[PDB]
Amino acid sequence: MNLFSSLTLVTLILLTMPIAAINFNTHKFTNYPLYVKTTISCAFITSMIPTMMFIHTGQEMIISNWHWLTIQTLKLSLSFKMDFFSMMFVPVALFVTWSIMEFSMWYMHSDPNINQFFKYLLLFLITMLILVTANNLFQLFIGWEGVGIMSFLLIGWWYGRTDANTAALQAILYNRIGDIGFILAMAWFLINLNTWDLQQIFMLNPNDSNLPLMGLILAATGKSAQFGLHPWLPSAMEGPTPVSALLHSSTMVVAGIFLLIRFYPLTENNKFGQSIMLCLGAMTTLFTAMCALTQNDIKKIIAFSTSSQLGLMMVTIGINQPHLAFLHICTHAFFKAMLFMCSGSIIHSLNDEQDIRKMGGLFKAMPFTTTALIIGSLALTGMPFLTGFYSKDLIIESANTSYTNAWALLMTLVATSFTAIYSTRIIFFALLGQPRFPTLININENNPFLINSIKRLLIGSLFAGFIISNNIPPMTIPQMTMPHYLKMTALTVTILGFILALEISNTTHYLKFNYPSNTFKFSNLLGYYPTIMHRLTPYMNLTMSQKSASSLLDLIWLETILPKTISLAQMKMSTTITSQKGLIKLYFLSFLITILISTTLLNFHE
Amino acid sequence: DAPPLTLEGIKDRVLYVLKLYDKIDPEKLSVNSHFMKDLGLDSLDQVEIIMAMEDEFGFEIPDIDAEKLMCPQEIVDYIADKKDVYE
Amino acid sequence: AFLPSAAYLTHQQKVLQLYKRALRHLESRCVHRDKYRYFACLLRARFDEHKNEKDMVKATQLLREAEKEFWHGQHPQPYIFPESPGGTSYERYECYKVPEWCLDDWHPSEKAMYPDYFAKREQWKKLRRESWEREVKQLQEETPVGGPRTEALPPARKQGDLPPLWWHIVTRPRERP
Amino acid sequence: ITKDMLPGPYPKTPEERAAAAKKYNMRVEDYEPYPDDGMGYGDYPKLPDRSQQERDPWYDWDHPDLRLNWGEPMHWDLDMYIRNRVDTSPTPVNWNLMCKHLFGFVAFMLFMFWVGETYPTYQPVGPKQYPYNNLYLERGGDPNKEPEPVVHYEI
Amino acid sequence: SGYTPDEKLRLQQLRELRRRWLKDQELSPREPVLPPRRHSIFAFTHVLIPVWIIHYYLKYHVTTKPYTIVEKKPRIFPGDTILETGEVIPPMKEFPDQH
Amino acid sequence: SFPKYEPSRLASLPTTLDPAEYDISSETRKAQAERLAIRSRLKREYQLQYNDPSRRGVVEDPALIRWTCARSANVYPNFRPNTKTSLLGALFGIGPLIFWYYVFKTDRDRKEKLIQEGKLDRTFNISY
Numbered sequence A: 001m002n003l004f005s006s007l008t009l010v011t012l013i014l015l016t017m018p019i020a021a022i023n024f025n026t027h028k029f030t031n032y033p034l035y036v037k038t039t040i041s042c043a044f045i046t047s048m049i050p051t052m053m054f055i056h057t058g059q060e061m062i063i064s065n066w067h068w069l070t071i072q073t074l075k076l077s078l079s080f081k082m083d084f085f086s087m088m089f090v091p092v093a094l095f096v097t098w099s100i101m102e103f104s105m106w107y108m109h110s111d112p113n114i115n116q117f118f119k120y121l122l123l124f125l126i127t128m129l130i131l132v133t134a135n136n137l138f139q140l141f142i143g144w145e146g147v148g149i150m151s152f153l154l155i156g157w158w159y160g161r162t163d164a165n166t167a168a169l170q171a172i173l174y175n176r177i178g179d180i181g182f183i184l185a186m187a188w189f190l191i192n193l194n195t196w197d198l199q200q201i202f203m204l205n206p207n208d209s210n211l212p213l214m215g216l217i218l219a220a221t222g223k224s225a226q227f228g229l230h231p232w233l234p235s236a237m238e239g240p241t242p243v244s245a246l247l248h249s250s251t252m253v254v255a256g257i258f259l260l261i262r263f264y265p266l267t268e269n270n271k272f273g274q275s276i277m278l279c280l281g282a283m284t285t286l287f288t289a290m291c292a293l294t295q296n297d298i299k300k301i302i303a304f305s306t307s308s309q310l311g312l313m314m315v316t317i318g319i320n321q322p323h324l325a326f327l328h329i330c331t332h333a334f335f336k337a338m339l340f341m342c343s344g345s346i347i348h349s350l351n352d353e354q355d356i357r358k359m360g361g362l363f364k365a366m367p368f369t370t371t372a373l374i375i376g377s378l379a380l381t382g383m384p385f386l387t388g389f390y391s392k393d394l395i396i397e398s399a400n401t402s403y404t405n406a407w408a409l410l411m412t413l414v415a416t417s418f419t420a421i422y423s424t425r426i427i428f429f430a431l432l433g434q435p436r437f438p439t440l441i442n443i444n445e446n447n448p449f450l451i452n453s454i455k456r457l458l459i460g461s462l463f464a465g466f467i468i469s470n471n472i473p474p475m476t477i478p479q480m481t482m483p484h485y486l487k488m489t490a491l492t493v494t495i496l497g498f499i500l501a502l503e504i505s506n507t508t509h510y511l512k513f514n515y516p517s518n519t520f521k522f523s524n525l526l527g528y529y530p531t532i533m534h535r536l537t538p539y540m541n542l543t544m545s546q547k548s549a550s551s552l553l554d555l556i557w558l559e560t561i562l563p564k565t566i567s568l569a570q571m572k573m574s575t576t577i578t579s580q581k582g583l584i585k586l587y588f589l590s591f592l593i594t595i596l597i598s599t600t601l602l603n604f605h606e
Numbered sequence B: 001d002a003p004p005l006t007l008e009g010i011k012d013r014v015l016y017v018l019k020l021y022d023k024i025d026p027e028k029l030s031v032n033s034h035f036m037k038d039l040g041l042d043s044l045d046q047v048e049i050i051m052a053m054e055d056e057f058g059f060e061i062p063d064i065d066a067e068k069l070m071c072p073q074e075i076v077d078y079i080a081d082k083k084d085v086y087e
Numbered sequence C: 001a002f003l004p005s006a007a008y009l010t011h012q013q014k015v016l017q018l019y020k021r022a023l024r025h026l027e028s029r030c031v032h033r034d035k036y037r038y039f040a041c042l043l044r045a046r047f048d049e050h051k052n053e054k055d056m057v058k059a060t061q062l063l064r065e066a067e068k069e070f071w072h073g074q075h076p077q078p079y080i081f082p083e084s085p086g087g088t089s090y091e092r093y094e095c096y097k098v099p100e101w102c103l104d105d106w107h108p109s110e111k112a113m114y115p116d117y118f119a120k121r122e123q124w125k126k127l128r129r130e131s132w133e134r135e136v137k138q139l140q141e142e143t144p145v146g147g148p149r150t151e152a153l154p155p156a157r158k159q160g161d162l163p164p165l166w167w168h169i170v171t172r173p174r175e176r177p
Numbered sequence D: 001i002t003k004d005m006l007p008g009p010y011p012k013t014p015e016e017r018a019a020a021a022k023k024y025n026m027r028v029e030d031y032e033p034y035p036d037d038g039m040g041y042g043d044y045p046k047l048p049d050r051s052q053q054e055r056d057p058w059y060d061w062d063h064p065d066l067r068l069n070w071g072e073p074m075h076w077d078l079d080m081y082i083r084n085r086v087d088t089s090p091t092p093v094n095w096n097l098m099c100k101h102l103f104g105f106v107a108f109m110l111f112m113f114w115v116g117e118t119y120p121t122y123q124p125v126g127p128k129q130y131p132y133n134n135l136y137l138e139r140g141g142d143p144n145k146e147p148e149p150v151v152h153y154e155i
Numbered sequence E: 001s002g003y004t005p006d007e008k009l010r011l012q013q014l015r016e017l018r019r020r021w022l023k024d025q026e027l028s029p030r031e032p033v034l035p036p037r038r039h040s041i042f043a044f045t046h047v048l049i050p051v052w053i054i055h056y057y058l059k060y061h062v063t064t065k066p067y068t069i070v071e072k073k074p075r076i077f078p079g080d081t082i083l084e085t086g087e088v089i090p091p092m093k094e095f096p097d098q099h
Numbered sequence F: 001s002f003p004k005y006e007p008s009r010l011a012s013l014p015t016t017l018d019p020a021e022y023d024i025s026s027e028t029r030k031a032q033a034e035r036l037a038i039r040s041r042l043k044r045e046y047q048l049q050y051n052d053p054s055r056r057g058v059v060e061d062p063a064l065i066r067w068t069c070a071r072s073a074n075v076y077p078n079f080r081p082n083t084k085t086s087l088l089g090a091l092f093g094i095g096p097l098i099f100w101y102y103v104f105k106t107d108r109d110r111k112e113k114l115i116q117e118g119k120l121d122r123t124f125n126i127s128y
């Protein structure tokens, strides 16, 4: 007990210490990024001890260490929850973050604000571990809004660029639309269960939980970029490649999925919420993987990859498999951060070139990035016994063998084929073929920061699915009896996606020029969704923000009715009273009319 | 990363791309060989030369600047001014 | 259409710009280099077919339906250069492009760290302030009545003069500060 | 700045229109005001309602981030048509065709989710069988009461 | 056609002034003129002293208050021996062997 | 043949697909030259002050000050109460107030009617 809780809080305090070091500074640093990388590596090593002694016994606890505020029946405390979800996600997040920062010491080397960048990246890590370790909804909302604001500050890193600021404000807009549902859920739990703590929510076990689960699904739609609130995650690639690699692939964007996994005792007793999650996740993983088939920016393709995987996570929450969804989070982190790091190695080797149509011939020119990109693509598509096999295939085996929305399963399988299609699209246009990049070659990947940072996630993307899937305890019953067409479905659909997309790729060398169909323009212009919704919905607001509210009401009519009408009335009465001609005759004639009205008509003498 | 361009290196690369173009004989070409007067090329050929310059150095030359670079020394001076060489 | 020196685009300029936009969008459609090179020579032949057209109404009509051809056959995501407008690295370093006048606001203890640089900046500022009145009186003696007609500027006509309105062109920040 | 360079009332006579066009630094033939319905525009020019993204980006602007020159009469919704905001730029696909394709795709997907919810897939199995009266004490049943005997047999 | 002679002359003069400016942005070998200004201490200051502080804080201020560190009770199997009692948990009933 | 581009309010017509782009007529030459002259005169007037070494401050833009004065102070002196403004001020000013009034009033009447009949599940609701 004394070892577990101590090293638990040591991980968080150790992560906070470089923030105090960068805020209490005078000198130009003796490599502050190496200091933050050493700090996060040692926080990973420290966090492995509570993880291992969770694996030994299942030891969970709650550190409610600081009483913060008692609102009459709501005792809000600094309360940390060390259960299975924290004990597995915190080492995975720290390991990925350590890889991203040793990558960042190479990639962001020309940046004169590298200390600000490492400060912001560590602030993201602190807010994400406030999110994943929280016991009450207020502290989870602290971590929630914290990763949203660090997402803002890290998308809009190069702030003289208009599109970076636009993408960051877009990410804030969609996440606040999710925050509507999050604060809806907090309101429901406070008014109906008198709590924000997870324990009293789980122990009271409410039955009429339709509305708080709809709020949580809206919060996860905003945070995990589900359908309806998706385009901020492809817009979020405008930030630097460590930002897209750490935050917007593997660690931040799973927080809505992590939110719905965290509330699994309430989603397991609500079939309507499961159907909503299932249909929404299948819609998202269809739509984004369909959009990824025809994109040309490599970071856009990997962003649609990670949003398709988040849609798959929402699917496997929707089939009442929360622990397989969390296993897919922990699995997905390794190879998706590694695929973004390989893309960043390509982009820096080709002098900030991010388009796949100016690549090629990099099979031998960048051999280590080629190896790791192939291993990451096979872990993404579900090569057997790589890391993605140990969750995603099981997800398919649980999505087939369950009382399921059948259209959701069928779109999940079409998305599974599309994953193989865009993965070999990456491999074909980036690595295979012939060069298309400009003629002055500066191709070099021989920095030990780059090599070791890709290497540790490469060891992860080989072995971590095996190691985690054999260390975690059983929390469900795995379905392991199914017919042979149904057991082999994920592998066969993945191989068929590879075959069909190899046919599509071999037809690209041909001398046949077709005009593009409506299918291509629909897959390439993002389902037409940001072309409509980002032009129409701001327009209808902003004109209403100026023509209706600003000019018509609070500059004209609310100005007309109370002050201007009264002022004109008093002006008019003032000009009537003082328009006398100075004639003594008229004033005394008015006095006689006064006396006659007073006596005869008003009777003031009776 | 990012090797610095020089006037001699840009001149070598511009004349190198122009020596690989089969409508210019590489022995008549010099740094002041005007494309329409000395080399006798079409305006379409001048557009293709500027597009090959763009594919060579990796940055777009706008058309208001592309329709005025009429000798290779003008192209070298334009790439020099837009990339700030000899710092 | 919209140009600093000229009020318009000529018909020849419109044909050249459509040719370049068509080849860039064709390269976006025709990714590989040999396949692009084949279809680019075919498009060059299509532009060489109507090169010697003397009826300007017919040439303007052919340019118009060639624009409609291009608008039907454009790529939805064309290839944009990284520093071209619409690029991934476009206006990325604008947050690092601090103007020169901010060096005037520095403290003398942080100006003393670079003695030769600011001592050399002082003669640039002196050259600018002695050239300014000569180039203003050069601009007013050469601009026609009613104001200037185009946004072009004259060069330095005398020996010892600097070209008019030169400071924020010469002392602009670098592309990679 | 002084009085005769500020915006004023709606011009009706052509000399007032010409003085307004000279004030807003533009031609009389290009100077259209807003229609005089009394919304509070006055003599302000109806600029042609474009975003600033459509402006020529290779042109040397006085404000390169805004793509806007000094002295140029700004649009009434200039703060709205900045490049951080609403774009009017020409789209490769027609706007109505985009709306029809997106509405058809979303409506068809929601219809097929309703169909698959009406017709769900499942496995050729019975219910999952639990001991101790479908786990009566585990599911929160009170021990003072007694459930009816739920019995599962071998097959 | 390309440039006018006035445009060529202006671009040459601006180019010369620009190259002089960019050359004059270089540094001197004395510049920047600066004013005149334990192997595993990271494992001591950043790790071990926080383990000391946090262990003191949890032992004598947090666990001294009720329900602050609440641990899930450990998992009990048939065949275990309790440390606080010595009571051997009796093993399971004999299995109807399936294979 | 080819599908014609249909321009919209938020997706305008391209410069190259506009039939007035190909005007070689002398009146359009005069209009483009006069706009060029206005733009060049404003450009020269800007960059004489912009390149001044003696100037240290803000090159004031009377277009910008004029825009802010039209957006802020000119609205009421060029307002006329007529049919259009009265119907838009009643539709957008008191309309949503009436709407949210009846919505929240119906909701709270339903909720209060359920509470004082012992019907609303208010089992753990003690924070209010």
Ligand SMILES: CCCCCCCCCCCCCCCCCC(=O)OC[C@H](COP(=O)([O-])OCC[N+](C)(C)C)OC(=O)CCCCCCCCCCCCCCCCC
Residues within 6 Å of the ligand: A065, A066, A067, A068, A069, A076, A077, A078, A079, A136, A138, A139, E053, E056, E057, E061
């Ligand atoms: C390196 C510098 C550190 C200090 C160096 C010197 C000390 C060395 C270490 C030895 C330990 C010192 C003594 C032990 C510390 C004090 C113990 C103690 O009982 O303290 C009294 C209390 C403990 O709680 P308490 O219950 O006794 O009292 C709370 C007060 N009432 C009851 C009125 C509500 O306070 C603290 O310990 C304060 C520090 C808490 C640590 C975490 C702070 C987080 C701040 C976040 C801000 C925003 C939060 C909002 C959300 C909250 C969640 C919903």
Ligand SMILES: CCCCCCCCCCCCCCCCCC(=O)OC[C@H](COP(=O)(O)OCCN)OC(=O)CCCCCCCCCCCCCCCCC
Residues within 6 Å of the ligand: A163, A166, A169, A170, A173, A177, A180, A217, A218, A221, A227, A228, A229, A280, A530, A533, A534, A535, A537, A538, A541, A542, D083, D084, D085, D086, D087
């Ligand atoms: C489980 C349920 C799931 C339900 C899912 C479906 C419901 C939600 C439907 C979608 C609603 C949100 C999407 C529409 C608004 C998107 C706004 C946005 O991000 O616009 C981006 C735009 C510029 O970005 P863009 O043009 O894309 O960038 C290209 C690079 N230059 O940026 C701008 O133009 C800046 C605009 C700033 C001002 C925005 C004004 C509009 C605000 C709209 C708020 C809507 C609130 C809805 C509340 C609902 C409550 C229940």
